[PDB]
Each structure stands twice: as C-alpha cells, then as structure tokens.
C-alpha cells in the first residue's frame, strides 16, 4: 500500500497528529489510515530523534524510514517560531526530493493562521493548518495526501 511519513523535530505534535489520522473515518509508529478515499500506511519518525538537534545519526535513521515513502508530511509548529532544526530538516527534505506536504500544527484557532508567514518560504507551498487538540484541518490534509498518491 501507499506509505506516508511524518517528519519533524520533537514536540511539534507528530504523535498527536498520527493518532488523529489513524482514528479518522469518512522507534517508528506505524498505522493504517483508512477512509472512503482508500488506505495508506502512516509512519511517525519522531521516536528516531534522541534530542532536539538534527544530527547525522538521526538523518540516517530518517533516510531508512523514508525509503519507500510516496509522501512526506513535514510537521512544523504552527505557533512557535521556526527553529534551526526546522530549517535543517527543510533543507534535508528538499534534497531528498520526495513530495512534501507542509503541515502546521497546533493551529487551534483560525487566528493563529494569520501568523504562518515564515512557513511559506520553506519551499513547500502553502502550509496546511491543523490542530490535533481541536481536530482541525484533517479533511484538508487527507485530500492533499491523496492528490499525491499515484
């Protein structure tokens, strides 16, 4: 089946997002997402990081996890400012060349969407705002995922 992988630094909300997507209807964490659009294997790579710094050790682990990935969900905090780790994971993803959907997390209220500007420059297109706490943007995220699964 199709494989979708979540990538991002620690504490941006990857496991929470993973859990919401897994429950959706219509070191790795692996789960089958199934809705009326079809099914795919969702993989969270957060457990591959030891600390919050992008390092060769982690990159090599992420590389393996991305082996047969069709789409990457690049998770960045939608409230906190972008970090050196974010910018480094972004460059790694551009180099990898796999389709990337930029996901802004913890966008609990529409007002937070006004402050996602720095995200548009990461080179991945408009970020899709989500909130696992309020279950926002999951429909839009599933639609984007399926537009890229061949």
List contacts with ligand GDP (CB under 6 A).
10-16, 46, 105-106, 108, 131-133
According to DSSP, the residues that pair with 38 across neighbouring strands are 35
Quick one: 32 or 135, whose CB is closer to ligand GDP? 135
Q: What's the rounded Cα separation, in Å, for the pair 133 and 136?
A: 8
Quick one: 11 or 35, whose CB is closer to ligand GDP? 11
132 among annotated binding-site residues: yes
48 among annotated binding-site residues: yes
9 among annotated binding-site residues: yes
46 among annotated binding-site residues: yes
* Minimum distance, C-beta of residue 12 to ligand GDP, in the bound complex (Å): 5
Quick one: 28 or 38, whose CB is closer to ligand GDP? 28
Strands 71-77 and 128-129: unpaired
Q: Which residues contact 87 (CB under 8 A, 6 or more apart)?
A: 122
* Minimum distance, C-beta of residue 128 to ligand GDP, in the bound complex (Å): 13
* Cβ atoms within 10 Å, residue 145: 22
CA 133 to centroid of chain Cα atoms: 16
* Minimum distance, C-beta of residue 38 to ligand GDP, in the bound complex (Å): 25
47 among annotated binding-site residues: yes
Quick one: 79 or 148, whose CB is closer to ligand GDP? 79
Q: In what order do the strands lie in the sheet with 71-77?
A: 29-35, 38-44, 2-7, 71-77, 100-105, 128-129
Query: What region does 97 belong to: left with phi over 0, alpha with psi -120 to 50, or beta?
Result: left
* Minimum distance, C-beta of residue 107 to ligand GDP, in the bound complex (Å): 7
- Residues comprising the binding site for GDP? 11-16, 108, 132-133
**Known binding residues for GTP:** 8-15, 44-48
């Amino acid at each position: 089946m199709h494989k979708v992988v979540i990538v991002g630094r620690p504490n941006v909300g990857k496991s929470s997002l993973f859990n919401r997507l897994l429950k959706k209807r219509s070191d790795l964490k692996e789960g089958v997402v199934e809705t009326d659009r079809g099914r795919f294997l969702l993989v969270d790579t957060g457990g591959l990081w030891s600390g919050d710094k992008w390092e060769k050790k982690i990159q090599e682990k992420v590389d393996r996890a991305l082996e047969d990935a069709e789409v990457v969900l690049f998770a960045v905090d939608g409230r906190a400012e972008l970090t050196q780790a974010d910018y480094e994971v972004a460059e790694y993803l551009r180099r990898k060349g796999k389709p990337v959907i930029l996901v802004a997390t913890k966008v609990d209220d529409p007002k937070h969407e006004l402050y996602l500007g720095p995200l548009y420059g990461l080179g991945f297109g408009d970020p899709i705002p989500t909130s696992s706490e309020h279950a926002r943007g999951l429909e839009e995220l599933l639609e984007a995922i399926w537009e890229r699964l061949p």
